[PDB]
Structure 1
Amino acid sequence: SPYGPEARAELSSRLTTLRNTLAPATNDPRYLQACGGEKLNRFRDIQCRRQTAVRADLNANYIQVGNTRTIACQYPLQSQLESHFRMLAENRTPVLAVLASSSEIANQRFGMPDYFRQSGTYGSITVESKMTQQVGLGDGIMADMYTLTIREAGQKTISVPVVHVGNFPDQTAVSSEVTKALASLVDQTAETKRNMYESKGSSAVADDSKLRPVIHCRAGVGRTAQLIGAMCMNDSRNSQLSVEDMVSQMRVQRNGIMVQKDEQLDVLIKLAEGQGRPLLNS
């Protein structure tokens, strides 16, 4: 009964209501609005919760799901790259997971700058990209890894591990098995980098706002939310956190579209079921 169609329909009912409530009004006080006259949102209907916004000029949010702290963001616009790199650096980012495919990035119509596979200078910030390992995730899906070294006068230099799912399927959802493998890789990568900072006595370890994995696809609501849900289920601190909790939490903390497609919710439900984790709150 817990994972039957009745429970799934009830979960969908609750989540649909929340999406509606969270729909942005014109000039919505709950959502970040552009400053300085620069385009902020990649998609007009996919907005950034103001109270959890990371930077005034990015579509990006702090998200905590149970105990699991991350940042979810859109793929940065060309105009946003310097700010995006400063966010990555200031966060001492232990892993940047990019879930937009190489095909998506290559479509110049989509305006997704190839910012992590290439070196470049963006205003005051110089970025060096290096290729590292490649890890298979299942079903031929491959995680290509990089390190981004971010340099800027007046700032400490920071290197950021990157996990890029370069052949993320463009038209279909990835399986629970691939999602699990991806969550494990992203978590493991973040743990290794966080450990390095701890070993150096970084003050960032004691700051709630820092050392957060940063995750984006194109809009940072579909594949991004699926991954974040799987990561929170990997976190041993999150016993008894329901699927209803995780999705409502992502939604209130970023926008109502988090877990955009039923196909993505299907995967979270399957993962939850595998763990005997509740779908619904009693």
Structure 2
Amino acid sequence: SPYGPEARAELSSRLTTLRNTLAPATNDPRYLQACGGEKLNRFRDIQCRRQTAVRADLNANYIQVGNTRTIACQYPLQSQLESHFRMLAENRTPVLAVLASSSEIANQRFGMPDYFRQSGTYGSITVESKMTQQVGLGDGIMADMYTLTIREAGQKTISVPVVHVGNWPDQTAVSSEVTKALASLVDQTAETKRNMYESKGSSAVADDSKLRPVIHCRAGVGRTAQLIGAMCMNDSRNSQLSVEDMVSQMRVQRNGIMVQKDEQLDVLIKLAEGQGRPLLNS
């Protein structure tokens, strides 16, 4: 069976090898290094691929899985908020998906600022938060939506749709059903916003680095990878893209930890099996 224990073992084997090869070394040329001074990485074991880095002062990466273009990042540190907001505005972000739990955000020891559920000022940038709709994803998992309006003197004001799942604890994986529903909501939200920019003739439509959904949890490697994998399988242009391809691409373009837990990988495998999508490359 293409989805049996033999195939699953082989997939794990290949992915394990890749994670080790991608392990970060001292002053690794493959990973973004702190530009001296403030901290760059929220975790010293979760690095940012240099060649695909979005900004020199952020732990965030451009990722393309098959034809699906996104941005994956860590939860921004307090000192990185101004840069985070500027990145969101310049990207003409069609949707920001936050998968960090309200419990993590509320834990002061974790240093995860609640930057999207309240308004505030960050350097020269002012942000307004407004609540919008709420969509149930199943199993009690809720998606709370907001709109973040980013203002800065001399810059165009940009509003960003936010999808926040506050009940998805770290080191865990929600069901394939919930994940599929989440991916559909995130893609739909982005499509509506992207279309608006196209109707206004935005120049971002011609920039491969812009109009990308932005997704993050705490480290930007577990929950974030599970959602990105589900999103690429929701892309009608990715026929024949294998699970091996998906995970190898996320790892090579961010870090070797993408898709951390085995249960998270199982969700991607289950979603693939439902589509008759291959797990391995021949």
TM-fit CA distance, 1:168: 1.5
TM-fit CA distance, 1:206: 1.1
**Secondary structure of the equivalent of 1:128?**
strand
**Secondary structure of the equivalent of 2:132?**
strand
- Sort the Cα spacing of 1:170 and 1:221 in 2 relative to 1 into closer, same or farther, 3 A: closer
The unaligned stretches of length 5 or more in structure 2 are none
TM-fit CA distance, 1:166: 1.4
Distance 2:13 2:171 in 1: 26
Distance 2:53 2:171 in 1: 29
Distance 2:243 2:170 in 1: 25
Give deviations 1:30-49, integer Å, cap 9, x for gaps. 00000131100001000000
**Secondary structure of the equivalent of 2:45?**
coil
Partners of 2:120 and 2:128 within 8 A in 1: yes
Give deviations 1:218-260, integer Å, cap 9, x for gaps. 0000000000000000000000000000000000000000001
Give deviations 1:123-173, integer Å, cap 9, x for gaps. 000000000000000000000000000000111110000000011234631
Partners of 2:250 and 2:258 within 8 A in 1: yes
Distance 1:279 1:170 in 2: 25
Distance 2:166 2:252 in 1: 30
The RMSD of aligned alpha carbons is 0.7
**Secondary structure of the equivalent of 1:20?**
helix
Distance 2:163 2:38 in 1: 29
The unaligned stretches of length 5 or more in structure 1 are none
Distance 2:267 2:21 in 1: 24
Q: Number of residue pairs matched?
A: 282
Distance 1:267 1:5 in 2: 15
Give deviations 1:95-135, integer Å, cap 9, x for gaps. 00000011110011110000000100100000000000000
- Sort the Cα spacing of 1:58 and 1:103 in 2 relative to 1 into closer, same or farther, 3 A: same
Distance 2:101 2:132 in 1: 18
Distance 2:53 2:233 in 1: 24
**What does residue 13 of structure 1 align with?**
13
Partners of 2:232 and 2:238 within 8 A in 1: yes
**Secondary structure of the equivalent of 2:115?**
coil
**Secondary structure of the equivalent of 1:245?**
helix
Q: Which runs of 4+ in 1 moved over 2 A?
A: 169-172
Distance 2:190 2:170 in 1: 26
Give deviations 1:15-60, integer Å, cap 9, x for gaps. 0000000000011000000013110000100000000000000000
The residue correspondences of 1:122-201 to structure 2 (distance < 5 A) are 122-170=122-170, 172-201=172-201
